[PDB]
Amino acid sequence: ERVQNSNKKEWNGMMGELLSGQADMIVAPLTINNERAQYIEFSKPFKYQG
């Protein structure tokens, strides 16, 4: 989400936490888009789903 402080854009939630180093491994039922994959290394997709 775009922060209103002259064009900063910051990930929120766990994505903010892992990017700020508060977390190291993110195990979650989370899908994979290009947007999160722009910065964050992903493992192999474990549970395939729709």
């Binding site: 994979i32 992903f42 192999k44 997709p45 395939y48």
Partner: protein
């Protein structure tokens, strides 16, 4: 670019990208003709009446 997956001895030698499609291991059989239903569907049901 061939349609191949990995096992643990492939992945040490070969280096996949992200998997684009998902598949699995199945068996193939054929059809039967009919089913079993030994004339007893409402027989415990109607036994209450």
């Amino acid at each position: 670019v061939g349609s191949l997956t990995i096992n643990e001895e492939r992945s040490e030698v070969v280096d996949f990208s992200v998997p684009f499609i998902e598949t699995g291991i199945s068996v193939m059989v054929s059809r039967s003709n009919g089913t079993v239903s030994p004339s007893a569907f409402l027989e415990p049901f109607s036994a209450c009446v």
